[PDB]
Amino acid sequence: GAMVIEKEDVETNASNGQRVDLSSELDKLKKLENATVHMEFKPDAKAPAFYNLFSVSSATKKDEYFTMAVYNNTATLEGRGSDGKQFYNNYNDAPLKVKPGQWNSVTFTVEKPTAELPKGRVRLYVNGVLSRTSLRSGNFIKDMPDVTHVQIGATKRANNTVWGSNLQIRNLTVYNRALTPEEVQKRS
Numbered sequence: 001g002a003m004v005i006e007k008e009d010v011e012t013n014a015s016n017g018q019r020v021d022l023s024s025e026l027d028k029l030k031k032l033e034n035a036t037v038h039m040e041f042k043p044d045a046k047a048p049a050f051y052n053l054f055s056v057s058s059a060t061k062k063d064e065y066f067t068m069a070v071y072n073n074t075a076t077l078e079g080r081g082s083d084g085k086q087f088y089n090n091y092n093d094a095p096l097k098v099k100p101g102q103w104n105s106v107t108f109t110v111e112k113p114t115a116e117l118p119k120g121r122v123r124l125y126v127n128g129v130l131s132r133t134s135l136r137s138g139n140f141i142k143d144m145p146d147v148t149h150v151q152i153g154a155t156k157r158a159n160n161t162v163w164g165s166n167l168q169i170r171n172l173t174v175y176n177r178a179l180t181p182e183e184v185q186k187r188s
């Protein structure tokens with residue numbers, strides 16, 4: 001199949017600066033056009049207001065990054081290129097929330113633009129259920145020329161590190177195609 005990254009049973013905590021570095025997998029991410037990023041995780045119960053689940057970021061460009069994040073329990077998503085402009089529509093007020101202190105999954109899919117999807121397609125699902133679809137772009141890591149770092153948890157944006165939290169991560173899986181809603185229902 002389509003699996004290009006799988007990381008199991010890792011965690012972010014004080015001892016690792018609330019971060020699991022995956023930056024060695026950056027070239028695999030840059031190559032993707034259609035993609036899925038899936039995480040199954042358990043946040044500590046009284047979570048920070050904003051915390052990153054999976055991000056790609058830059059040592060030189062503070063505002064160029066991709067993040068799947070949680071904001072006041074809402075599963076959210078943002079990608080910004082070398083001009084700092086948004087790749088996707090706002091997800092901060094997307095309808096689906098995670099339950100901290102328990103197991104949850106969040107799945108992001110991206111489809112590059114095609115004849116029938118002229119601006120591409122991005123979806124975020126929470127616990128197998130579509131939260132929001134965004135048809136602004138199908139931009140992804142291939143569209144971020146200055147990225148250097150990949151991580152679960154605390155995210156290095158140039159000379160600052162932000163969005164850390166304590167997470168148990170049963171798995172992070174990245175695929176080289178966009179799973180369908182039906183696959184997200186069964187494969188989560």
Ligand SMILES: CC(=O)N[C@H]1[C@H]([C@H](O)[C@H](O)CO)O[C@@](OC[C@H]2O[C@@H](O[C@H]3[C@H](O)[C@@H](O)[C@H](O)O[C@@H]3CO)[C@H](O)[C@@H](O)[C@H]2O)(C(=O)O)C[C@@H]1O
Pocket residue numbers: 050063069071076077078092162
């Ligand atoms: C998904 C999401 O909400 N992303 C926003 C992000 C997060 O809410 C926070 O990081 C969570 O803690 O906040 C961002 O804004 C915070 C930073 O703004 C920077 O200044 C901006 C300024 O506010 C802009 O209006 C201006 O046009 O450009 C400046 C340079 O970036 C500050 O310099 C920085 O210290 C923070 O205050 C973020 O970038 O983190 C915006 C995300 O969209």
